[PDB]
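Example S7 (structure tokens).
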């Protein structure tokens, strides 16, 4: 498992532009994508990250993967990362080879396809998981294949960027319980999600809004620290993940800080 820490992190996607402008002539001010971000999770813990559209959630994951350097603060992490990107993707080849890396573990594979609900899908194909991607998959199928790929990989830190985005409420719930909570029980993970139930199960919660930490702490803390926000969303969780994003974004603007 990895430990993960951000201490006072501020970052600007535009920083490079400023550096080139100064180079051509021989710290940047602007709109930070992330501002004064703090969190720590221990080995094996889950951090749920939520927030409004454009808040920096994906950008936060990108900093952990070394794609964006902090202009201020420190990030500490080590080890192997598995990343489930916000848009799904599929490489030419079988369903099974979309899921598995260099090595194959029969049992691990079966338990991944089971927890991501891919069994019923696969059983409707003449060639099962050996069907070649010819035929095209739904957005829901693709996203579940992409999550199985990320979770199958043996890693130290799993970064799951809205993997329930295109799923219904029921499928989202079973997969969250079987995969994220059971199958990955002992793994360090960061899940971008809009479900209040998910934040209730997390070890830590980070809510972002306009780049800033709207909230960091536990679920109990959230209910008292942001009591009107909490009250308005706690029936939000019966809406689709797709739909909960617009509502959550409205709700953060509604109870935005000072
Ligand atoms: N990989 C990237 N490289 C550079 N800029 C990025 C990258 N990903 C997102 N951005 C930009 O960073 C800013 C913050 O948005 P980001 O995508 O981090 O928000 P988000 O909270 O993930 O939103 P959504 O909820 O809409 O997925 C946006 O202007 C976006 O265009
Ligand atoms: Mg999102």
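Recovered sequence:
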């Amino acid at each position: 498992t990895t430990e993960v820490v951000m201490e006072n992190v501020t970052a600007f996607w535009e920083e490079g532009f400023g550096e080139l402008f100064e180079k051509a002539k021989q710290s940047l001010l602007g709109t930070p994508v992330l501002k004064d971000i703090n969190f720590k999770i221990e080995r094996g813990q889950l951090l749920a990250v939520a927030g409004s559209t454009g808040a920096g959630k994906t950008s936060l994951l990108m900093m952990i993967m070394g794609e964006l350097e902090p202009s201020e603060g420190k990030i500490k992490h080590s080890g192997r990362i598995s990343f489930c990107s916000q848009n799904s993707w599929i490489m030419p080849g079988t369903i099974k080879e979309n899921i598995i890396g260099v090595s194959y573990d029969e049992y691990r594979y079966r338990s991944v396809i089971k927890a991501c609900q891919l069994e019923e899908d696969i059983s409707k194909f003449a060639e099962k998981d050996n069907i070649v991607l010819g035929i095209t998959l739904s957005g829901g199928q693709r996203a579940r294949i992409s999550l199985a790929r990320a979770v199958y990989k043996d890693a130290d830190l799993y970064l799951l960027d809205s993997p329930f985005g295109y799923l219904d409420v029921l499928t989202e719930k079973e997969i969250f319980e079987s995969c994220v909570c059971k199958l990955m029980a002992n793994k360090t993970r960061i899940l971008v999600t809009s479900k209040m139930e998910h934040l209730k199960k997390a070890d830590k919660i980070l809510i972002l809004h306009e780049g800033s930490s709207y909230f960091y702490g536990t679920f109990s803390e959230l209910q008292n620290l942001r009591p009107d926000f909490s009250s308005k969303l706690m029936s939000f969780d019966q809406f689709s993940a797709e739909r909960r994003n617009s509502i959550l974004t409205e709700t953060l603007h509604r109870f935005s800080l000072e």
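Notes on this example. The chain has one domain: 1-258.
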